[PDB]
């Protein structure tokens, strides 16, 4: 993939969260996520997909990934999905939006899902 | 094994007739394929995701999510959909999701890059 | 306003909430919302906008409204916006997605905002 | 306490859209929005609500407003609702998440809604 080199590596969000990922040539994202916020301790497995043949009009590369917030330290009974685009060049960034869904009883389902945005850069 | 690995592993159908075949792994992995029924999509695309392999036993649903990049060997729509939701098991087993579809865009068009919606998957055709 | 009549009146969500609205010829939505879930006691003011000259190809009518969850009896320090479209006809619906934002500290901002959907109908489910 | 004066005024988002708004004592927001992107020309009416009695623990003031993209110059068959919170003081700002829905056929309904986020400050941007 074209941005397999630019994607693979270590990324930091605005809050201090760290994302390490390897971009496969087929389009896989594999890695670990470590949150600066929430009911999270240490690293959690991340799996994802990216467009491995983007357009060539200076358009970004579409990707997305999931982290379920269970590891050998803790279980928040929740999962976050990040949807977004990788932009490369001088100040590469992954700009995302996300949905964090918690497992709830039916009664509480209406309030199961938070939404937000995250920008990741190669430096922080 | 995961508590809902057997419940989750299988074929799922949403309200639009899109179909998703997933294997739940013991660790929390979800792997499989998605066939969309709407938009710039043709045949099967790879899906990868994660689920809570040890959910609450208070009768809460099981948190999960998965991602489809809309490239396969026949088409590329330059976009990706992430589904975030939860699995409820039983006779009327379902997966309730909210989703995000991001297209690759220029910076001028970034502001309108991401669609939002909701899908409900059941084990039967709608 | 084309769907001014079809929009005006009482609507119900699948969760037993009710919304009463008057659609003005100007594209105003005015009315009140009465909850069935959340820190929500009784009636709350609603204000919003609708497209008063829709397309004529069988497309819906875009609209949105806000409720700040403060009335004379309770205050949840939060607000919901509903963005959606009105579809009229035999089985008239208003299909929405919404954002519920709570007032927070900067520390807790990242989890200020919940997201969901609701479908409103003219008949009480 | 009441941020009527704080909220009331001229705001600009990161893309140079302008938002003139008057907060009322009853929790009303009224004014105009002029966009810098999309099918928009000049000013559109906005109406909304804010919490007229917010917490006193450093919390922001929850708010929300709507613009239907119809005026005497253009009709884009859509509406945007912003949901967010006002924070006063230095770097007084309104942080929002937004949903933009267009009227569609039932066939195109799955992709009727865009999502994003906007931050408004009183300083017009670059
Ligand atoms: O605690 C967790 C699980 C880990 C949170 C990580 C999130 S994912 C989006 C954002 N971006 C980051 O980097 N970190 C945060 N969830 C949860 C559920 C319900 C209420 C609350 S307060 C917290
Ligand atoms: O065409 C595609 C890619 C495949 C769409 C499948 C979606 S994913 C969420 C939802 N759930 C399903 O089962 N199907 C739909 N994207 C795209 C981008 C920009 C404008 C438009 S119209 C379409
Ligand atoms: O729940 C409320 C106030 C009542 C709204 C309930 C929602 S608004 C969208 C949807 N449509 C309905 O009719 N009901 C639901 N506030 C609140 C604030 C902070 C945290 C939490 S959990 C709850
Ligand atoms: O073009 C418009 C009307 C103006 C949208 C401006 C947006 S509202 C959220 C964000 N915040 C701003 O300040 N600007 C942007 N609607 C429309 C309809 C159908 C398809 C598409 S792509 C766009």
> Where along chain B do its domains lie?
5-122
**Would the CB of D66 count as within 6 Å of ligand 4?**
no
Q: CA of C80 to nearest chain A CA: how many angstroms apart? A: 12
CA-CA distances (angstroms) from residue C31 to A75, B3, C44? 43, 47, 9
Provide the 10 A C-beta neighbour count for residue C20: 15
Sign, CA dihedral D87-A83-A73-A20, equals: negative
A13 close to A33: Cβ distance less than 8 angstroms = no
The preferred substitution site among C16, C32, C37 for testing ligand 3, maximizing ligand atoms within 8 Å of CB, is C37
Please state, in angstroms and rounded to a whole number, the distance separating the CA atoms of residues C72 and C46: 14
Strand A9-12 versus strand A18-23 pairing type:
antiparallel
d(CA A45, CA B31): 14
DSSP letter at B105 equals: -
CA A119 to chain CA centroid, nearest Å:
10
Q: Is D113 on the interface with A (CB under 8 A)?
A: no
The span from the CA of D66 to the CA of D43, in Å, is 13
* List of residues 6+ apart from D42 with CB closer than 8 A: D34, D71, D73
Distance, CA of D47 to CA of C66 (rounded, Å) = 8
Candidate CATH numbers 3.10.20.80, 2.60.120.10, 3.40.250.10, 2.40.128.30; the one for domain B5-122: 2.40.128.30
CA dihedral C36, C37, C40, C45 (to 10 degrees): -60
Query: Measuring CA to CA, which residue among B108, C103, A52 is closest to residue D16?
Result: B108
D36 touching chain B per CB within 8 A? no
Q: Which atom of ligand 2 is nearest to the CA of D108?
A: 22
The response to whether B45 counts as a known ligand-binding position is yes
Q: Which of B53, B55, B98 has its CB closest to that of A103? A: B55
Q: C71 to chain B nearest CA, in Å?
A: 30
* Method of determination used here: X-ray
CA of A89 to the centre of ligand 4 (A): 27
Q: Which two tokens stand for residue D39?
A: 């099918």
Q: Which residues does a chain break follow in chain B (C to N more than 2.5 Å)?
A: none
Counting as contact any 3 or more CB pairs under 8 A, the partners of A are: B, C, D
What is the C-alpha to C-alpha distance for residues B48 and C85, in angstroms, rounded to an integer? 33
- Hey, of B86, B97, B116, B119, which one would you mutate to test binding to chain C, going by the most C CBs within 10 A of its CB? B116
First vs last Cα of chain D: how many Å apart?
Answer: 32
Report whether B111 belongs to an annotated binding site.
Answer: yes
> What is the C-alpha end-to-end distance of chain A, expressed in Å?
26
Q: Which residues of B41-58 are buried (b: 16+ CB within 10 A; e: fewer)?
A: beebbbbbbbbbbebbee
What own/partner pairs with CB < 8 Å and gap ≥ 24 does A71-76 have? Answer: A71/A41, A71/A42, A71/A43, A71/A44, A71/A45, A73/A41, A73/A42, A74/A39, A74/A40, A74/A41, A75/B52, A75/B54, A76/A38, A76/A39, A76/A40, A76/A102
Counting from 1 in the atom list of ligand 3, the atom nearest the Cα of C44 is: 4
Find chain C residues with C-beta within 8 A of B116's C-beta.
Answer: 97, 115
- Greatest alpha-carbon pair distance for chain B in Å reads 48
Identify the CATH assignment for D4-121 out of 3.40.190.10, 3.40.50.2300, 2.40.128.30, 1.10.287.1080: 2.40.128.30
Can you tell me the distance from the alpha carbon of D85 to that of A115, in angstroms, rounded to the nearest whole number?
A: 14
Q: Is the CB of B81 under 6 A from ligand 2?
A: yes
Measured at the CA of D95, the angle between CA C99 and CA C35, to 5 degrees, comes to 25
Structure tokens at D77: 């068959």
Name the phi and psi angles at B71, rounded to 5: -120, 135
Q: Can you tell me the distance from the alpha carbon of C68 to that of C72, in angstroms, rounded to the nearest whole number?
A: 12
One-character DSSP codes across C46-105: EEEEE-SS--SSS--EEEEEEEEEE-SS-EEEEEEEEEEEEE-STT-EEEEEEEEEE---
Residue C16 tokens read as: 């037993």
Which chains border C (3 or more CB–CB pairs < 8 Å)?
A: A, B, D
Q: Give the Å distance between the CA of D114 and the centre of ligand 2.
A: 12
Contacts of C96 in chain D (CB under 8 A): 101
State the Cα–Cα distance between residues C54 and C66, nearest whole angstrom. 21
Instruction: Answer whether B89's CB lies under 8 Å from B114's CB.
Output: no
Query: Cα–Cα distance between B47 and B65 in angstroms, integer?
Result: 10
Ligand 3 within 6 A of CB of C103: no
Is the minimum CB–CB distance between D18 and chain C shorter than 8 Å? no
Tell me the DSSP string of B55-85.
--SSS--EEEEEEEEEE-SS-EEEEEEEEEE
The answer to whether B65 and B95 are in contact (CB under 8 A) is no
Interface size B-D, in CB pairs within 8 Å, comes to 30
In terms of Cα–Cα distance, which of D108, D34, D41, D114 is closest to D80? D114
């Amino acid at each position: 993939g074209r941005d397999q080199a630019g994607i693979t590596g270590t990324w930091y969000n605005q809050l201090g969260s760290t994302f390490i990922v390897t971009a496969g040539a087929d389009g896989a994202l594999t890695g670990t996520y470590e949150s600066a916020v929430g009911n999270a301790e240490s690293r959690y497995v991340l799996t994802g997909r990216y467009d491995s043949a983007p357009a060539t009009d200076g358009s970004g590369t579409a990707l997305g990934w999931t982290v379920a917030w269970k590891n050998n330290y803790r279980n928040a009974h929740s999962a976050t999905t990040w949807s977004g685009q990788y932009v490369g060049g001088a100040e590469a960034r992954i700009n995302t939006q996300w949905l964090l869904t918690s497992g709830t009883t039916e009664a509480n389902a209406w309030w199961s899902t938070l939404v937000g945005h995250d920008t990741f850069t190669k430096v922080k």
